[PDB]
């Protein structure tokens, strides 16, 4: 016997996941989810997600663990290039687009999206950064689009030899192979810190 209050004020995971427009990888958006009951069962029981990897916590032990903050990051990346979304990984995305901490605790979501983000002529709304002076720190974003000083001749804001443009756009197209089709990605982060606990899993009675 156990009798807990009514279930109300559920977290808006539906609008985060079932959206239409996702930002590019170099300009991912972050949304703070807090002060609501978060039922992660509806996320797991869905068969739409091809990739569901959880680091530091079993997925079915989330409906009892009460955190304080949940962050959601959404972006679109290539097919054979989603393997870089994992702690301690190397590649263009990890180096210059989105860096995950080595001790990251959370879950990564990825499902194919060839039905919406592929134009027969070519979808060019999605860009990924190629160059930067140094590696991204864990959980920061770069928005500046200055000319990358490839060599030692100063660019002075004018594109030239060894003066390249850092942002290049994916040429998404339905004809592309499985390894080149777009893959929507959502990353959930869980924090514990000295504050009252707000988010919880549903408590069945």
């Amino acid at each position, epitope marked *: 016997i156990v009798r807990f209050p009514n279930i109300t004020n559920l977290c808006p995971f539906g609008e985060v996941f079932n959206a239409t427009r996702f930002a590019s990888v170099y300009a991912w958006n972050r949304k703070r989810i807090s002060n609501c009951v978060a039922d992660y069962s509806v996320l797991y029981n869905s068969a739409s997600f091809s990739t569901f990897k959880c680091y530091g916590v079993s997925p079915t032990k989330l409906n009892d663990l009460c955190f304080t903050n949940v962050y959601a990051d959404s972006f679109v990346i290539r097919g054979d290039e989603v393997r870089q979304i994992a702690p301690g990984q190397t590649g263009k995305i990890a180096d210059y687009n989105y860096k995950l901490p080595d001790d990251f605790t959370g879950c990564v979501i990825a499902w194919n999206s060839n*039905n919406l983000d592929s*134009k027969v002529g070519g979808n060019y709304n999605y860009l990924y950064r190629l160059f930067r002076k140094s590696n991204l720190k864990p959980f920061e974003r770069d928005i500046s689009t200055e000319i990358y000083q490839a060599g030692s001749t100063p660019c002075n804001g004018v594109e030239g030899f060894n003066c390249y443009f850092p942002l290049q756009s994916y040429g998404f197209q339905p004809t592309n192979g499985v390894g080149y089709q777009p893959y929507r990605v959502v990353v959930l982060s869980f924090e514990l810190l000295h504050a009252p606990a707000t988010v919880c899993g549903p408590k069945k009675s």
Partner: antibody
Amino acid sequence: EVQLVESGGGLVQPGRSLRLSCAASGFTFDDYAMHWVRQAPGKGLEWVSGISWNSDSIDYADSVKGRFTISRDNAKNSLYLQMNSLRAEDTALYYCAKDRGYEILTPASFDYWGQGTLVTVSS
Amino acid sequence: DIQMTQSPSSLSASVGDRVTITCRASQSISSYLNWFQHKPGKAPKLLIYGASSLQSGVPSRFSGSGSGTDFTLTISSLQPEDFATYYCQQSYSTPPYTFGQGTKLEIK
């Protein structure tokens, strides 16, 4: 439960112009794409035109290029289709479909439709 | 280019049978086909998006299958409100959104 009501149909002489409108109220209109689908009086369906969520990419059917101009109004939750230089083979039935995605030429198909409006081209 | 065909044109069945309709394409489309239920008196409705994915809110009696070039729609129970004309559409080639011809379905 989404509503798509059309108007502007009737009868015009060949070579004249007429306009169509299609009002949407059951969903968020500012970030979906829409199309126009023609059904012949005694034949199958046929695509005509399409517009993006914002008026950037517009495509037309091969048989109606250079004659039809589709428009869109995000503020009033309505889209229009200006028909120009009508001939005798455009006496069909016109629907107002809704795209599942946000672009024009995607694998995603038409999700929600509306009742057709009847047009006639004869003297 | 691309061409789209409908093998059956008129079919007959009863309330307690099963009906399969096949749609054939001229070139490979890679599981990008859609099936529409067009009632003669109202606005046509979509049943299956993608090769074999069933849209929300429609009965599970309709079942689609097939990939590559040849596709097929299957109906299991044949409830007596299931009279309509069904079209198959491709959304993968350069000629945009090509519709196949009608497939009349009457019960007797």
